[PDB]
C-alpha cells in the first residue's frame, strides 16, 4: 500500500536517525570539549595549533619556495637589510641635527625592542 | 587576558591608577611629559576589562588602551568568583 | 581537560568559519574545499526533496492532472498523532515548486526521480572526492566560463525535452531545416504561453543557450580588459565574497520579481501558495545576500584594506557626506510614508476616506503604459493598444502601491545607511577614534565618554538585520495582499484599504488569520494545526530574541553566578561538580546581541510562512 | 646631547620618507609587487609622473598609428550604425522573424562592431594624445 | 559537615584542575616576575608561615569581627584564595567586599577573598579610611603565597624608581598600524602588540605601495622546467635605472626634509 | 560554610550522610544499587499512569519501559560526566581516576532496572 514502504523504514530509521544519531552527536560533542583538540585550531597557543606552526617553519627552512611570500616578519622581505640600514645611517647623518649623538642602529634597537610579556607568544616563555 | 597598553600621550594623572579595580595600572618614572612620571600596566593578568581606567582618563583619547580579547578569557579577565581554573 | 567556560563555545563558534583565523586551512584551496563540501551538501539536500517526492509522492498522478492534484512533499510518521490525526493527515504537502520543476524539466515518471536521487548523491560524492584534495589545480575550476558552459548545457538539456522536441528534426544530422524546425524546441514568443500559464521549455532552453553564449564573450571581453590595464591591487576574500554577495542578492531578487511575473514552470500560477512561498523565500535570500556584502565589504575595511587614494579612500573622506545624506533620505522617506499613511488612518477613522492624501504613482504608471503594458490601462504616457500582446503576470498599480513603495524605499535606504555607516565607521569615529585596531566585532568601548553601546561595526549589522527584515516584511506584506486580492478576485478592496494602516491590520493580517487559527480548536484538528503550532512557536522564539535583546549581561551574569551558588551548595552534587569543568558563565555581549537577533529573525520567517501557508492555502 | 621631543619626531619621519622610498625599488621583494597585482608590468608603464595614459594601455595593438585607430573606429561605427539601422527600423529583422524567415547574418556581424568602434577611438585618442 | 559541605578535600574535587588548564587554556600563563615589572626588582618573599591558607586558620585573632556570610568564596570548590593584611589604629566597622559589616580589630588584621577585586576594593575602601600598608597576598592550591598590590612596597599611585614601564608604546593610539597593513604577520589581528618600527615599517610600506610609478615590478618566478623564456624586456637594465631611480628619489626627499 | 539548621543541624548531617552517596561502609556497587532502586521505583510512578497509554491494560508495562530508558538515559549521562570529569570522589587507593563514579553510575542503571521492574511487579500484582 501507499503507506507501507516510508513505514518500515521509518520505524527502523526515524528512532535511529533522531535518537542514536542526536544523542550520538551530542555526546561526542561533550567530549569533544573535554578533549585535548577541542577548538585547537581557534584557541590560541593551543599544542596542536603551535606543533602545527613549527612544522610550517621547519618546512618552509626545508623547502624554500621559488615564489616570494608574505614576510612574516614585514622587514623580513628586504633582500639586502644591511643596504637598508646603509642608506637610512646615510640618510640620517645628512639630516642629523647638528652633531646629534644618536645614531641609527641604536634607534632601531630601540624601535624594534617592545616590553609586553602579556602578550600571548611571550606567555609561553617564547 | 586583555590586551592593556600605554602610549605617550599620557601625563601621569595617576587617574587610571587609581581607578582600576584590580591593581593593573602602575606609575613608572618617564622623561616624556611634565610630571615626569608615566602609566604601565605589568599585572594585565588581573585585568577584568571593565575599562574604568579608559574612563578616567583625561586626554583627547584614551592614553591608555584596554583592548579586549574574548578569545584568551580568564578566570581572573572573567571576574570567576565560584569556578577556580588553578 | 575542559577547564574552560560556556563562553567558549559562543566564542569558537562565532568564528568557527572564520576559516582566514584558521591557520591550519588558511590557503584558498581550503576555501575551494569548503565551497565543494557546501555544494555536496545543496545537492544531497536537493536528493532529500526528490528521493521523498519520488518515494512518497503523486508526481505520476501529478503530471497528470498539474491543476486537479496537490503535490506532496513525503510522508508524515510523527508517532504523537493520534489515531484520527493519523488518519486524517495523508502526508506532508508541497510548499515549493518542485513538482511544476520536475514537470517543466520533463520528468514524466517516479524512475526519472529515483534516478535523479541516484545522480545527485552521486555528484555530492563527487564534490566531497574534490573538497578531498584541495590543490592549485582545482583553483582553475570556475570561472564565468564555466558558469555559461553549465547554461549552454542546461539549454541543451531543455531542448531534449522541450515539449517540441518529438516534432524536431535532428538538426546535427539532416541539418537546421526550416526555421519552424528550430522553433520546435528554441523559440521566443515572450511571457506567458497560455495552458500551462507558464514560459515555454522552448524559450527557457534560448534563453540559457543565449546567456551561455553571451556569457562566454563577456568573460573573454573582461580577461582582454586584465589584459593591458592587469591590476589586482587589492586582493581579499572578503572583497571577492562581498562582490559575490551582492550580485548573487541582486540576482536571486530579480529572480523572485521575474519569476512571479514571468513564471518558467508549467501550471505555476495555478497553485497559489507555492507562487507566494516562492517570491517571499527568494526575497528574503536575495536580502540576505545582500547584506552579507555589504558585512564582508565592510570586514574587508576592518582588517584587509590598506588606505590609498582609491575609489574605497575617496568613499573613507567623505564618509560623512554619504552617512548625511542617507540620514536625510531616510529621515524624509520615513517622515513622508509615516505621515500620510496616518494622515489616512485619521481620514478613514474620522468617516472621510475621501480627505486621504493619494498620491497617483504616475512615474510607475508612465512607465508601465509606455514600456510594459499592451493595452490601455491608465491612458497617460502612451494610449496606444498592442495587435499581438504578449502574457505576463504584472499586477496593475494603484494609490496605495505609491506609498508601498516608498515604504520600502525608506527601508532599503536605512538598511543602506546602517550598513555604510557601520562599513565606513570601522575605519573610526570621534568615539573611536581608532577601531581599526579593535576587529570588525567587539562588546563595547566601555561605560566612558558618555557611553559605547553597540559602537562595533559587527553591531552595525546586528542593527540593519531588523531593517532588513523589517524591509522585506514590509514588500513581502505589499506583494502577499496583492496577489491575494488579484486571486479572490477583489482588487478594489487592496487599492482603498492599502491607503491606511488600519486596512493593513484589518484586511490582510486579521482577515488571513482567521484559518489559520482554526488549525486547532475545541472542535478538532484539521491540516492547518502543524502552521498555527508553528506560528506560536514562532512567537516564542521572537519573544526568547526580546529577552536577549532587552537584557543584557551583567544581570544574567550575577543570576548564573547565584545558581552556581545553589549548585554548588547543593546535596549529592557538590561531590560531583565544582564549576571548574565548563564553567558556566553569561553569554558575552556580542554573542548575545546574536542570539538575540537570531531567535527574532528565526521567529520572523517562521511566524510568516506559517501565515503565508495559512492564508493562501 | 639630550635628544629632542621633537628631534625624535624628525627621525621617525626621516625613517618613514626612507622606507617609503627605498620599497618601492627592487630591494624589498614583497608578493604585492608582483607582475600582476599592484606594479605597472615591467617593460609597459601606464602612465608616468602625470597621469598621462601611455601606449602601453592599449595591449596588442599599442604601436597602431593614431590615423589607422581613427579609420578603424569610423568604419566600425559606419558599419555598426548601417547593421543597427537595418536590423531595427530598415528592413526589421523581427519582424522577418515573424515572416518566418531566419536572421540576415550580414546586419547583425555589421551591429556587433559598435563597441568595437567606442574602444577603438578610446586607443585612437589614446595613441594620439601620445604622438604615435 | 557533609550536607553542608562537599565531604571530599578540596584537592579530590579539583581534580585535574591543573594540566588541564595548562591544555584547555595556554594561553593563560603569567609572566616571568608576576607582581613586578622588571627582574631586578627586590621581590620579596613570602611563606605560609606569614600569611596561612584560609583552611588552616580557625578563630584566628587576626581575623576582624566577622559573622560569616553566604558571599564568601567557594570553600573546597575554589582553591585560590586572595589575602589582605592590613593593620589598624582603631576597632571601627567597615563593609565587606561580599557585602555585610565586619568590624576591624585594634591592631593587625586579616582577611580571606576568592577574587583579587574584592581585596582592591577593600583596600579602597580602607586607604578612604586613612590606613596605610595594606597588604594583598594570593594563596595558590599548593599553598605558595605571592605578595600583591603594593609589589614593591609603594603602593601604584606614587611613582617608585626601579618600575619599568611595561606595554608602553611609543606613540599615539591612532599610530598604531592598521590591520590590513600588518596582514599575513603575527599581528594581524592585534596590531597594538606590533612594535613602532614594525608599525613604522607598515606604515612606510603602503605609502611606497601607492606609487606605482615608481614601484618595480618584482619580475616572475621561473617555475616551468622548460627553458627561460626570452622574453622582450631587459631585467637588468630595469634593475639598474630603478637603482638610479630610487637613490634620486632618497636624495630629493631627504632634501625635502 | 554558613550553618543552618537545615544543613548542619545533627539531623541534616546523619541524614545525608547515612544516604547511599555518602553511607560509610558501602561499596560504589552498594551506593548505585540503592540510589538506583530508588529512583527506578519512582520512575515507574509518573509514566504508567499520566501517560499516553493510561487507561490500557498495559499501562504499567509501558510505564516500565518508560522508567527504564529513563535510568538508562540518566545512567548514559553519568557515565558521560564519568568520562568527561571523573569526579574522584569516591575512587580507592590507586585505581584510576573517576572509577568509584562510574562503578556509581553502572550499578545505578542495575537498580534502576531493578526497582523499575519490582514497582512494575507491585502494579500487575496486588
Ligand atoms: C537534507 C537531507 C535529508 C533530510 C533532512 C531528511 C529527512 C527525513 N528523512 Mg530522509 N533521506 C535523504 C535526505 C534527507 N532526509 C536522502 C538523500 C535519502 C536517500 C538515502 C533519504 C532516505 C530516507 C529513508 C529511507 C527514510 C528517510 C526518512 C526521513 C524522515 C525521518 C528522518 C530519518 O530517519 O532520516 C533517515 C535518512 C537517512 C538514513 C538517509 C541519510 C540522509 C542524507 C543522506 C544525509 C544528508 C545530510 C545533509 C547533507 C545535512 C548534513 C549536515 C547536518 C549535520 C546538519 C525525515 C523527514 C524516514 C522516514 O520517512 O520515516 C518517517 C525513512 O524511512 N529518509
Ligand atoms: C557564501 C556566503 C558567505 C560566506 C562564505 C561567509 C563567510 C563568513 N562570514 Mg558571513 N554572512 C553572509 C554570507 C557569507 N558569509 C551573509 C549573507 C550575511 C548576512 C546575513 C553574513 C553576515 C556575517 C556576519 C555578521 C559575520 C560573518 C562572518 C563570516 C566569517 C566567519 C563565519 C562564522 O564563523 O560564522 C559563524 C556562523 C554561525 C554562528 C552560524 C549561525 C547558526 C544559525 C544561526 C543557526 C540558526 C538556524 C536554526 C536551525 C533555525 C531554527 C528555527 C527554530 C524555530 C527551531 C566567514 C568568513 C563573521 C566575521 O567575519 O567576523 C570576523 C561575522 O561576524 N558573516
Ligand atoms: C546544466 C546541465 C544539465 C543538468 C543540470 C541536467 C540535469 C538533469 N538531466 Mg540532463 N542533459 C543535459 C544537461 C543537463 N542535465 C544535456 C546537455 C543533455 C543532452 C545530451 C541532457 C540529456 C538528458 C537526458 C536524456 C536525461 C537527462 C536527465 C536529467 C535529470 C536526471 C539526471 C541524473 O542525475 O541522472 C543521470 C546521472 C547520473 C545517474 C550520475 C551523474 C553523472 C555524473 C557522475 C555526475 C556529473 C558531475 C557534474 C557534471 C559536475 C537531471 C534533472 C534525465 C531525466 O529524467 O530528466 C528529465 C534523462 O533521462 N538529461
Ligand atoms: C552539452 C551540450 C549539448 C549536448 C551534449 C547535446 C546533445 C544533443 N543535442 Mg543539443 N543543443 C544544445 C546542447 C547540447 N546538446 C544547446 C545549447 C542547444 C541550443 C542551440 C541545442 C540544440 C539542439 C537541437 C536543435 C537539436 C539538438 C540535438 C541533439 C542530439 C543530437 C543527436 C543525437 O542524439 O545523437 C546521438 C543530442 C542528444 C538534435 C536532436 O535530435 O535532439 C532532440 C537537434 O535537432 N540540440
Ligand atoms: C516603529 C518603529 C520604528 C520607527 C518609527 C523607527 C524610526 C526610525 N529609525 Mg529605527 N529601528 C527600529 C524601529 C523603528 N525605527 C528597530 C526595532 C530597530 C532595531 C534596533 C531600529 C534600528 C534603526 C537603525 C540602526 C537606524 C534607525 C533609523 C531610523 C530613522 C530613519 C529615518 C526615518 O524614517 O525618519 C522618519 C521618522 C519617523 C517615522 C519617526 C516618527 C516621526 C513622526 C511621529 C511621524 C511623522 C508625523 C508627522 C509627519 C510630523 C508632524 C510635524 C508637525 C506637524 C509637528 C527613524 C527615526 C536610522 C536613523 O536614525 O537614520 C536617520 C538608523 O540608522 N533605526
Ligand atoms: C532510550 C533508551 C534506552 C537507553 C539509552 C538505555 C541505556 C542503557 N541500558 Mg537500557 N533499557 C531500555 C531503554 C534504554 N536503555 C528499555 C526500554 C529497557 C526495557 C527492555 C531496557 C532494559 C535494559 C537492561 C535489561 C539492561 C539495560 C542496560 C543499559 C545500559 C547499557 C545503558 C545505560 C544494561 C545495564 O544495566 O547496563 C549497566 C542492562 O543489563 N537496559
Ligand atoms: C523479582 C524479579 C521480577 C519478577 C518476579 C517479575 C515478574 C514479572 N514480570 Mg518483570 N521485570 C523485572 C523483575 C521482575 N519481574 C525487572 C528487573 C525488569 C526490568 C528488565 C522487568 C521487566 C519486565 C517486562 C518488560 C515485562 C515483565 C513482565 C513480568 C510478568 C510476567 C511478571 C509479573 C511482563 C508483564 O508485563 O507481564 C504482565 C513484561 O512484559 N517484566
Ligand atoms: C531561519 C534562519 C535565520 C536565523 C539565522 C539568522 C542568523 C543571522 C545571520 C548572521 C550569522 C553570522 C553572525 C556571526 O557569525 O557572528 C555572530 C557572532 C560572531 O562571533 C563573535 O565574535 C566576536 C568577535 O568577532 C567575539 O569573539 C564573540 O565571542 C563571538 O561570539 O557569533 C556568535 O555570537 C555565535 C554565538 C551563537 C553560536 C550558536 C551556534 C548555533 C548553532 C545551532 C545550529
Ligand atoms: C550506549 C553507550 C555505551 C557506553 C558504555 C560504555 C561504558 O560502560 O562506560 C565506559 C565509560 C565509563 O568511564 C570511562 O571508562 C572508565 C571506567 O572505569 C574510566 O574510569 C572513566 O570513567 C572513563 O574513561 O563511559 C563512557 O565513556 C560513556 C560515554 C557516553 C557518551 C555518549
Ligand atoms: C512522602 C513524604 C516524604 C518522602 C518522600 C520520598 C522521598 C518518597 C520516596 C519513596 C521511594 C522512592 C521509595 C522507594 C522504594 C524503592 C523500592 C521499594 C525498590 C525496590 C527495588 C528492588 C526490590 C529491586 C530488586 C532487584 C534488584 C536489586 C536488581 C535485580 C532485579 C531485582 C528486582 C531482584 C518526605 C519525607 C519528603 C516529607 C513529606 C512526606
Ligand atoms: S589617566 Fe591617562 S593620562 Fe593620566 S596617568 Fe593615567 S593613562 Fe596617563
Ligand atoms: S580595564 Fe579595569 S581591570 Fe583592566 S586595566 Fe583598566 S581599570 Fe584595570
Given at each position: ?17 533522531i535518537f542514536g544519531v542526536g544523542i550520538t552527536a551530542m555526546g561526542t560533542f561533550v567530549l569533544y570539549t573535554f578533549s585535548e583538540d577541542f577548538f585547537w585550531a581557534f584557541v590560541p597557543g593551543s599544542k596542536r595549533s603551535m606543533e602545527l606552526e613549527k612544522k610550517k617553519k621547519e618546512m618552509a627552512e626545508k623547502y624554500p619556495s621559488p615564489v616570494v611570500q608574505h614576510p612574516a616578519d614585514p622587514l623580513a622581505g628586504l633582500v639586502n637589510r644591511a643596504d637598508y640600514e646603509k642608506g637610512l645611517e646615510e640618510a640620517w647623518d645628512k639630516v642629523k641635527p647638528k652633531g646629534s649623538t644618536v645614531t641609527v642602529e641604536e634607534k632601531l634597537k630601540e624601535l624594534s625592542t617592545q616590553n609586553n610579556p602579556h602578550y600571548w607568544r611571550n606567555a609561553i616563555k617564547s | 587576558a586583555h590586551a592593556v597598553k600605554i602610549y605617550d600621550t599620557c601625563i601621569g594623572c595617576t587617574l587610571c591608577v587609581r581607578a582600576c579595580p584590580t591593581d593593573v595600572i602602575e606609575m613608572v618614572p618617564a622623561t616624556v611629559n611634565a610630571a615626569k612620571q608615566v602609566a604601565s600596566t605589568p599585572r594585565v593578568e588581573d585585568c577584568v576589562g571593565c575599562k574604568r581606567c579608559e574612563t578616567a582618563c583625561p586626554t583627547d583619547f584614551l592614553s591608555i588602551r584596554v583592548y579586549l580579547q574574548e578569545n584568551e578569557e580568564t578566570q581572573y579577565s572573567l571576574g570567576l568568583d565560584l569556578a577556580d581554573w588553578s | 581537560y575542559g577547564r574552560c567556560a560556556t563562553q567558549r563555545y559562543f566564542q569558537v563558534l562565532g568564528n568557527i568559519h572564520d576559516i582566514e583565523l584558521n591557520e591550519s586551512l588558511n590557503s584558498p584551496q581550503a576555501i575551494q574545499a569548503l565551497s565543494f563540501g557546501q555544494l555536496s551538501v545543496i545537492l544531497l539536500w536537493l536528493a532529500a526533496y526528490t528521493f521523498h517526492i519520488g518515494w512518497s509522492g503523486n508526481f505520476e498522478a501529478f503530471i497528470d492532472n498539474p491543476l486537479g492534484v496537490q503535490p506532496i512533499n513525503h510522508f508524515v510518521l510523527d508517532p504523537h498523532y493520534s489515531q484520527y490525526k493519523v488518519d486524517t493527515t495523508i502526508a506532508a504537502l508541497t510548499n515549493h515548486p518542485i513538482y511544476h520543476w520536475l514537470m517543466t524539466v520533463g520528468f514524466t515518471s517516479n524512475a526519472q526521480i529515483y534516478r ?502 | ?132 | ?257 | ?126
Open positions: 500500500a501507499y503507506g507501507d514502504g516510508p513505514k518500515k523504514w521509518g520505524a527502523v530509521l526515524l528512532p535511529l536517525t | - | 535523479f536521487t541516484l545522480g545527485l548523491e552521486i555528484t555530492a560524492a563527487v564534490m566531497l572526492v574534490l573538497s578531498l584534495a584541495p590543490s592549485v589545480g582545482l583553483l582553475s575550476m570556475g570561472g564565468l566560463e564555466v558558469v555559461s558552459w553549465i547554461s549552454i548545457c542546461w539549454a541543451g538539456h531543455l531542448v531534449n525535452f522541450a515539449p517540441g522536441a518529438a516534432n524536431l528534426t535532428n538538426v546535427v544530422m539532416e541539418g537546421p531545416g526550416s526555421l519552424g524546425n528550430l522553433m520546435n524546441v528554441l523559440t521566443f514568443n515572450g511571457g506567458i504561453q497560455l495552458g500551462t500559464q507558464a514560459l515555454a521549455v522552448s524559450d527557457v532552453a534560448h534563453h540559457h543557450v543565449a546567456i551561455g553564449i553571451v556569457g562566454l564573450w563577456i568573460s573573454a571581453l573582461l580577461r582582454v580588459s586584465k589584459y593591458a590595464w592587469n591590476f589586482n591591487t587589492q586582493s581579499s576574500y572578503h572583497l571577492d565574497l562581498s562582490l559575490s554577495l551582492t550580485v548573487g542578492g541582486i540576482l536571486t531578487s530579480l529572480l523572485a520579481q521575474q519569476a512571479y511575473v514571468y513564471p518558467a514552470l508549467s501550471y505555476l500560477p495555478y497553485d497559489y501558495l507555492t507562487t507566494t512561498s516562492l517570491y517571499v523565500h527568494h526575497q528574503y535570500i536575495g536580502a540576505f545576500l545582500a547584506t552579507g556584502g555589504f558585512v564582508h565589504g565592510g570586514i574587508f575595511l576592518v582588517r584587509d584594506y590598506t588606505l590609498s587614494n582609491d575609489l574605497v579612500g575617496k568613499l573613507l573622506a567623505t564618509k560623512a557626506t554619504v552617512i548625511s545624506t542617507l540620514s536625510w533620505i531616510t529621515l524624509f522617506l520615513g517622515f513622508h510614508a509615516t505621515g500620510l499613511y496616518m494622515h489616512n488612518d485619521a481620514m478613514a477613522a474620522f468617516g472621510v476616506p475621501q480627505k486621504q492624501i493619494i498620491i497617483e504613482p504616475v512615474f510607475a504608471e508612465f512607465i508601465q503604459q509606455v514600456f510594459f503594458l499592451g493595452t490601455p490601462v491608465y491612458g497617460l504616457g502612451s494610449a496606444a493598444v498592442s495587435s499581438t500582446p504578449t502574457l505576463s503576470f504584472l499586477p496593475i498599480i494603484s494609490g496605495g502601491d505609491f506609498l508601498v513603495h516608498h515604504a520600502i524605499a525608506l527601508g532599503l535606504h536605512t538598511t543602506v545607511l546602517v550598513l555604510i555607516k557601520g562599513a565606513l565607521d570601522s575605519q573610526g569615529s570621534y568615539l573611536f577614534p581608532d577601531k581599526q585596531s579593535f576587529g570588525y566585532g567587539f562588546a563595547c568601548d566601555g561605560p566612558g565618554r558618555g557611553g559605547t553601546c553597540d559602537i562595533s561595526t559587527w553591531d552595525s549589522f546586528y542593527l540593519a538585520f531588523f531593517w532588513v527584515n523589517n524591509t522585506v516584511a514590509w514588500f513581502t506584506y505589499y506583494f502577499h495582499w496583492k496577489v491575494l486580492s488579484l486571486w479572490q478576485s477583489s482588487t478594489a478592496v487592496f487599492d482603498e484599504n492599502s491607503l491606511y494602516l488600519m486596512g493593513w491590520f484589518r484586511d490582510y493580517l486579521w482577515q488571513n488569520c482567521a484559518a489559520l487559527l482554526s488549525g486547532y480548536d475545541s472542535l478538532g484538528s484539521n491540516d492547518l494545526a502543524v502552521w498555527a503550532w508553528a506560528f506560536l512557536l514562532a512567537h516564542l522564539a521572537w519573544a526568547t530574541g526580546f529577552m536577549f535583546l532587552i537584557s543584557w549581561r551583567g544581570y544574567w551574569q550575577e543570576l548564573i553566578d547565584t545558581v552556581i551558588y545553589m549548585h554548588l551548595k547543593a546535596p549529592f552534587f557538590n561531590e560531583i561538580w565544582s564549576a571548574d569543568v565548563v564553567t558556566p558563565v553569561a553569554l558575552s555581549i556580542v554573542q548575545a546581541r546574536f542570539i538575540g537577533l537570531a531567535h527574532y529573525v528565526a521567529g520572523f520567517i517562521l511566524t510568516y510562512l506559517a501565515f503565508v501557508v495559512g492564508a493562501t492555502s | 646631547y639630550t635628544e629632542s621631543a621633537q628631534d625624535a619626531k624628525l627621525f621617525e619621519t626621516v625613517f618613514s620618507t626612507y622606507t617609503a622610498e627605498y620599497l618601492k625599488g627592487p630591494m624589498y621583494e614583497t608578493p604585492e609587487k608582483m607582475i600582476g597585482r599592484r606594479p605597472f608590468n615591467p617593460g609597459e608603464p601606464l602612465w608616468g609622473e602625470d597621469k598621462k595614459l601611455t601606449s602601453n594601455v592599449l595591449g596588442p595593438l599599442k604601436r597602431v598609428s593614431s590615423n589607422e585607430l581613427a579609420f578603424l573606429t569610423m568604419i566600425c561605427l559606419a558599419i555598426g550604425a548601417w547593421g543597427e539601422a537595418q536590423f531595427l527600423w530598415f528592413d526589421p529583422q523581427f519582424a522577418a522573424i515573424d515572416r518566418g524567415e531566419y536572421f540576415n547574418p550580414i546586419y547583425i556581424i555589421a551591429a556587433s562592431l559598435l563597441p568595437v568602434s567606442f574602444w577603438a577611438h578610446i586607443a585612437c585618442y589614446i595613441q594620439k594624445a601620445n604622438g604615435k | 559537615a557533609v550536607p553542608n559541605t562537599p565531604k571530599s578535600s578540596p584537592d579530590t574535587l579539583a581534580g585535574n584542575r591543573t594540566e588541564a588548564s595548562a591544555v584547555s587554556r595556554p594561553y593563560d600563563k603569567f609572566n616571568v616576575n608576576y607582581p613586578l615589572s622588571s627582574p631586578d626588582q627586590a621581590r620579596t618573599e613570602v611563606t605560609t608561615k606569614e600569611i596561612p591558607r584560609p583552611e588552616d586558620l580557625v578563630d584566628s585573632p587576626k581575623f576582624p569581627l566577622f559573622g560569616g556570610s553566604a558571599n564568601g568564596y567557594m570553600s573546597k570548590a575554589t582553591r585560590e584564595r586572595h589575602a589582605i593584611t592590613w593593620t589598624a589604629k582603631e576597632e571601627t566597622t567597615f563593609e565587606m567586599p561580599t557585602s555585610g559589616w565586619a568590624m576591624m580589630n585594634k591592631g593587625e588584621n586579616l582577611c580571606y577573598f576568592r577574587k583579587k577585586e574584592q581585596c582592591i576594593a577593600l583596600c579602597k575602601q580602607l586607604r578612604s579610611m586613612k590606613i596605610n600598608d595594606v597588604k594583598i597576598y594570593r594563596l595558590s592550591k599548593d599553598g605558595t603565597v605571592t605578595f600583591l598590590h603594593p609589589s614593591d612596597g609603594v603602593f601604584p599611585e606614587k611613582v617608585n624608581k626601579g618600575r619599568v614601564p611595561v606595554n608602553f608604546r611609543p606613540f599615539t593610539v591612532c599610530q598604531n598600524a592598521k590591520q590590513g597593513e600588518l596582514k599575513f604577520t603575527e599581528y594581524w589581528t592585534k596590531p597594538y602588540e606590533a612594535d613602532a618600527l614594525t608599525t613604522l615599517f607598515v606604515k612606510a610600506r603602503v605609502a611606497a605601495y601607492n606609487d606605482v610609478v615608481n614601484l618595480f615590478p618584482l619580475p616572475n618566478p621561473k617555475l616551468t622546467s622548460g627553458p627561460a623564456e626570452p622574453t622582450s624586456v631587459d631585467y637588468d637594465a630595469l634593475t639598474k635605472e630603478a637603482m638610479e631611480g630610487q637613490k634620486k628619489r632618497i636624495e630629493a626627499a631627504m632634501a625635502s626634509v | 560554610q554558613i550553618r543552618s539548621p537545615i544543613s548542619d543541624s545533627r539531623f541534616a548531617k546523619n541524614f545525608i550522610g547515612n544516604t547511599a552517596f555518602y553511607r560509610e561502609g558501602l561499596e560504589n556497587w552498594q551506593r548505585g544499587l540503592e540510589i538506583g532502586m530508588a529512583h527506578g521505583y519512582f520512575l515507574v510512578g509518573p509514566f504508567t499512569t499520566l501517560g499516553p497509554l493510561r487507561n490500557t491494560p498495559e499501562a504499567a508495562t509501558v510505564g516500565l519501559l518508560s522508567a527504564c530508558a529513563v535510568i538508562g538515559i540518566v545512567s548514559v549521562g553519568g557515565l558521560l560526566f564519568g568520562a568527561t570529569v571523573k569526579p574522584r570522589a569516591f575512587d580507592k587507593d590507586g585505581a584510576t581516576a573517576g572509577s568509584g563514579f562510574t562503578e556509581i553510575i553502572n550499578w545505578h542503571a542495575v537498580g534502576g532496572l531493578g526497582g523499575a521492574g519490582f514497582c512494575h511487579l507491585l502494579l500487575t500484582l496486588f
